Structures are given as structure tokens and as C-alpha cells.
Ligand binder design. Sequence first.
Ligand code: FMN
Ligand code: 1JA
Length: 370
Amino acid sequence: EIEILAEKIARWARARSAEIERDRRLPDELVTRLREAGLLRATMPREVAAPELAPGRALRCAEAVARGDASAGWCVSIAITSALLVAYLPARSREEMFGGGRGVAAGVWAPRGTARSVDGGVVVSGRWPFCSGINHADIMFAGCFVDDRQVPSVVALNKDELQVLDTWHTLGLRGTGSHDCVADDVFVPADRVFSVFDGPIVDRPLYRFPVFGFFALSIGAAALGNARAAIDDLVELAGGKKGLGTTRTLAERSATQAAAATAESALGAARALFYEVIEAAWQVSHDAEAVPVTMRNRLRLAATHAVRTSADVVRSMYDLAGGTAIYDNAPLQRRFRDAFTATAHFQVNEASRELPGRVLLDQPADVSML
Ligand SMILES: Cc1cc2nc3c(=O)[nH]c(=O)nc-3n(C[C@H](O)[C@@H](O)[C@H](O)COP(=O)(O)O)c2cc1C
Ligand SMILES: CCc1cc(C(=N)S)ccn1
């Protein structure tokens, strides 16, 4: 049923999409809707009054919201990924920050922070770009290195303690407000410092599902929903777009027909693989052993394929629309700008094909972050 709420919320995001972009943030009323549906805490554990939603359902919700507006969808993706880390907190700090239904999380994985140990915890400083959703998050999980360690850690920071810098001036995904955040000698109690590589404290199937795979897949979900919206925009425009020569509509051209078919099947294929691998990994997340590397590899293969295929689909629809889509009032223009902002994400760029290829070819590979 959360899926039905997500589709309703997608229609609200679509209605507000000009405001989202103009203000570089989600309207308060839209955040309230998302919160009341449980979408911004969907994957947090049941102990904090949260749905602990199965990953395929959560990702389908993000995809649905992104079809309404890619930035709104991306904020769901980042919220439901960051929410997983609530399962890595000791019970005391988990209750403090997320108990009784409280707390929305943001999260930047890049270990930009430097943390020094002190009596009771660490003192951390750093600057993190790409803090999606910080405008409506209470807590930001941030990567850092603690003293001498060569394996990075995560600190759970209150937004209160950070300086948010106005840096998010971007081609697309403007509504994500993915600004830089700065910590200046912030004290973090020891029980808000952890290592993802040590695994969750809440050891149930949702947190056995590959966490780095889920993050990648959440970007795929937003990209896929955006590409679906782009096809829908094209199809609506074509047929009515008549032009001024004595040929006729855009939809009546063979090239438009072949391109529509090519895009529809490419997107359908990417989406089908996406949900197939999620379900396969979800099944084995119920087993005693850690989800294996072969399965983790399939998730990363599918996430990157989804983002890259989505961009190819949106580029094709934009190109078909010709002089219509170059203007700021054209819906396809924002889809295009959003699709080509999403492609830059480090989990799903062209470079992200190389490690999953090494795994396929049985080559030596560091798979700690697969
Ligand atoms: C619109 C957008 C929002 C992003 N949000 C986050 C985030 O909240 N947390 C994170 O670890 N990465 C996030 N990323 C990943 C990086 O921002 C990605 O864009 C990066 O720029 C790729 O190169 P890099 O290695 O310099 O980070 C985001 C990326 C984009 C494009
Ligand atoms: C998601 C990629 C990544 C993860 C981490 C650790 N989880 S902190 C560090 C660097 N890069």
C-alpha cells in the first residue's frame, strides 16, 4: 500500500516540479506527505517505529516518485539508502536519534572527514559535497578516517552541528539541494561512530542485503523513473506536433516510430533486469551466509546499466522533440538535465563497470565495497 501512496505523492511532486527546481528544495508540504507515508524512513528498523520495508518495494517507491519528479525521487533514494545505517547504530544512540518515529537521514559515503579520538568519542572535521536532502534531514551519516586507520568509518552527525554551504548550482537534480556540508571540530560520542565493514547491529534480512548494492540501485531507481517520464513526455508531444512543411506529425515519421520502440524496449529491459537481480539478492539475504560476491556483482552491473540506459533513452526522447525541448518551458528539458546530472554519480558511472567486469572475468579484485 505504500506503493499506492508513492504514486499519489509522485503526482504531487509533478505538480510542484517548477517550485522544486526554482527553490532547489522540496516544498514543506511535499516533505510532510513523504514523511506521513513513511517513505523517508521506510528502510529503518522496526525498533524505531519504521516499516523496515523490503528493498524491492522501497526501490519501486523511489522509482515511482522519480517519474513524477526526478529530484523528489532522488531524495527518496538517498533517504532510504541512508536509513539503512540506522541498523548499524548501538541501541542507545539509535533510540536517541531515531526513536519513536523521529529522524530523517542524509548520507555522504566519501570519507572526507578527519576524526581524532578523545575521551568519550572523536572530534571530526571535514567538508562533504553532494549532501542530497540535507535541507530536510536531521542526521547526516558521513564518511571519515579515524586517527591512524586506513579503513574508513562513519560518524552520525546532527545537522545542527554542520555548516551548510550554498554550493548546489547544477545542470539538473536542482531540487535535491545537494549542498556541501562542513564540520568544524565537532565532538561525536563513541556510540555514533561505526564501520560499515563491521556489519549491522540489527541482523535481519533487510540489513543483510548488500548495502553498497542498495545505494547504487537507488540511483538506478531514480534514473529509471525519470526515463519513463521522458518517454511519456515524447509520446504525448508526438502526434500533435505538426510542423510547417506539408509533411505531417512527428509521430507519423518512421524514424520516430523506430526510436520510440527502441527506447521502450531498452528501458523495459533495464527495468526488468533491475527488479530481477533485487529479488534474487533478497531471497539469499534470508540465508545464514553473507550475500555472495557473485550476487553483489549482479546488483552493481544492473544499477550501472539502468543509469546509463536511462540517459540514452532520455537523450533520444529529447532529440526527437527537436526545437520544442530546447526551451525552458518544455518538460523534456528538465528530464534531460536531470538524466545527465545522475550519470555523474560515482556508484553508477562508466568507471563503475570495471570492477564488476573483473569479477566476471575471475580476476583479482578488492570487492570490499561491491
Ligand atoms: C545529484 C547528485 C547527488 C548526490 N548525492 C550523494 C550523496 O547524498 N551521498 C554520496 O556519498 N554521494 C552522492 N553523490 C555522488 C557524487 O556526487 C557524484 O556525483 C560524484 O560527483 C562523482 O564523482 P566524485 O568521485 O568526485 O564524488 C551525488 C551525486 C549527484 C550527481
Ligand atoms: C560507497 C563507496 C564508498 C564507501 C566508503 C565506506 N563505506 S565509508 C568509502 C568510500 N567509498
